[PDB]
Design a protein around this ligand. Structure first.
Ligand SMILES: Cc1cccc2c(=O)nc(N)[nH]c12
Ligand SMILES: Cc1cccc2c(=O)nc(N)[nH]c12
Ligand SMILES: [Zn+2]
Ligand SMILES: [Zn+2]
Lengths: 364, 364
């Protein structure tokens, strides 16, 4: 396989469906990436993650650099071997996590256990982890943001994008086996998003992420920003909306040109008792499910819905049992992957717009 | 298959190996039963429990009667359907758990959320759960015990054994599809153990458990009591040592005539970081495993040892990750089942005594 090849097989409006071929495997798009913060998709074996339909997962530079350590993982053979996932892995740059979970300067960021992070070290950490899709080191502008602060932050991110590109290219093994994605910033302002998109295109990346969203702005605002922001990015490269994952959010983003997604909602809310269904999410802890023998979702074909009832999972979660977390999480990620499959197929068949309408009608 | 048929295929000294055929499946003996307190073997799907080699699991009358409820589980189709385990299930009577996790009288026991438990209600609860092997309702004598208190308790247990037998027999469906095991008491006193064994044999049961042990007495004392206690039980019926599970404990008990075991050690200690190996247990949290690429145990053929390193599991447990619990638990139960398989095969081949010696030499 090639280091990286994104091919668009079908389109409908701004939506696209296709594939990204990489050395470790093929990624079907639009794609959803389960999040695996500490070298594990919480409560799931890698084979279960794959069984749900996931083609790629997301790892984090921040968490892993702290524990168990980037150099250590490299010494142990890389993240893939370490956690037992042999397919593509996209790693965030750590910038966003640092300013969420510090001394900021043009050189990078320092945090407390004093650790430092810069464009060059971020890229090196992702190399040590053995990441397939490396994210440029950026600064996720807080929401809301004044145009001045948004501009300053975006400008710094573009300078860091250039530094990330060069760091990545100076490492032969990494440049030949991995891919590099740039990240668009600019808050909710069209002129800044345009400047950011242009700066990124000038540098040149294998993919372009839309950053700075999913940080407090409602869906209406997010969609408004995507409306003018995605068209600014190179059409022949993947478009990655970072941190976005809610079912309806994903459908709307795909309708606007997004090809990739990631978010902790499926996993985290799963462990909290929230199960996704085509008729909307349900809180399995609610008393009304104590004797409900139906599966989490009536149409879902995941292993959990084929074997256990809402009543049983209700019991497990209220009892604080680990199996509860395991079952809720497997179903949720499977639901997400099923959503992506439906999106891909509808686009391929030229009926995505109708699928989106039907989805919203029943989900809400 | 028959409701119950215990057959001894081979012997060596006091050790025996054979099978218990029941309607839901065959149990190979000596057998180890993973414990599933709240309708779940902690951190494991039923199929994983089966994959490790388990032929039967243990459920609890106490925990389930409280949550989610015996009548409720019955309404939902029984414990088997509820948790997704379709093979034999042995249920403890709840007596021991009550006096561990209250008003005691000749009629039974009351506890606080005021609930009552008696021989008749215990048997009814196990019936509602759909248990395959029902345990008589007894009183586990605290250790140490004066001969007077030990006698009083044992005598009451025998009266309750008679009541359990009659309750079980008066329920046609239960008497025809399930089996009933009596429980020997008498603390560490030979004369009381003899009286208890005789009273149980007079009533007649499908199997006989040695109760009152694994309650604080060292292995030396436990073995001394088993030495004279097991021979008192009917030879052609299974001998079940309740709550006993440590590797060396199990080997020694089998050497003394025990056919069945159960204990939370594999699962509970697994979640705590203790992994069993042929060279003795290890605490995976220890710093010396941070970069150890070897599997938990060098010979173990479980799925965990085939895929992940000590270093990875070390990371997961120290990070408090659910997958850590899942992997540690699967390996430990698999180790226990492998121990039982080795015991069964060595007995069948007339080299168990040698296996016990070799096992102890390396394990210690
Ligand atoms: C993970 C994530 C979510 C949402 C936004 C962002 C962002 O702007 N930059 C980075 N690196 N990551 C993000
Ligand atoms: C589970 C267990 C462990 C150890 C001892 C005992 C006992 O004596 N009686 C019952 N019912 N259960 C026991
Ligand atoms: Zn499902
Ligand atoms: Zn193992």
């Amino acid at each position: 396989r090639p280091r990286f090849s994104f091919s668009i097989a079908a389109r409908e409006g701004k939506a696209r469906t296709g594939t990204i071929e990489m050395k470790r495997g093929v990624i079907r798009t639009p794609a959803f990436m389960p999040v695996g913060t500490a070298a594990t998709v919480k409560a799931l074996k890698p084979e279960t993650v794959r069984a749900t339909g996931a083609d790629i997962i997301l790892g984090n530079t921040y968490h892993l650099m702290l524990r168990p350590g980037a150099e250590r993982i490299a010494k142990l053979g890389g993240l893939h071997s370490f956690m037992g996932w042999d397919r593509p892995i996209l790693t965030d740059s750590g910038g966003y996590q640092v300013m969420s979970l510090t001394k900021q300067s043009e050189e990078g960021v320092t945090f407390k256990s004093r650790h430092m992070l810069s464009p060059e070290r971020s890229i090196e950490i992702q190399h040590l982890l053995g990441s397939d899709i490396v994210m440029a080191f950026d600064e996720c502008t807080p929401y809301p943001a004044t145009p001045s602060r948004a501009a300053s932050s975006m400008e710094r991110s573009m300078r860091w994008a250039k530094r990330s590109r060069d760091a990545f290219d100076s490492r032969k093994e990494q440049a030949e086996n991995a891919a590099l994605f740039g990240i668009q910033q600019g808050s909710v302002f069209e002129n800044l998003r345009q400047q950011s998109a242009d700066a990124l295109a000038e540098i040149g990346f294998d993919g372009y992420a839309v950053g700075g969203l999913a940080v407090g702005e409602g869906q209406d605002e997010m969609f408004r920003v995507l409306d003018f922001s995605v068209p600014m990015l190179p059409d022949d490269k993947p478009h990655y909306l970072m941190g976005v994952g809610k079912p309806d959010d994903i459908v709307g983003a795909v309708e606007r040109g997004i090809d990739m997604f990631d978010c902790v909602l499926p996993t985290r809310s799963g462990r909290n008792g929230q199960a996704f269904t085509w008729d909307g999410p349900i809180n399995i802890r609610n008393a009304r499910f104590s004797e409900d023998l139906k599966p989490l979702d009536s149409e879902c074909h995941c292993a959990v819905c084929q074997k256990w009832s809402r009543a049983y999972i209700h019991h497990l979660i209220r009892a604080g049992e680990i199996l509860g977390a395991m079952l809720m999480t497997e179903h949720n990620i499977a639901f997400y992957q099923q959503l992506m499959q439906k999106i891909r197929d509808s686009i391929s068949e030229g009926r995505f717009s109708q699928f989106a309408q039907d989805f919203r009608a029943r989900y809400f």
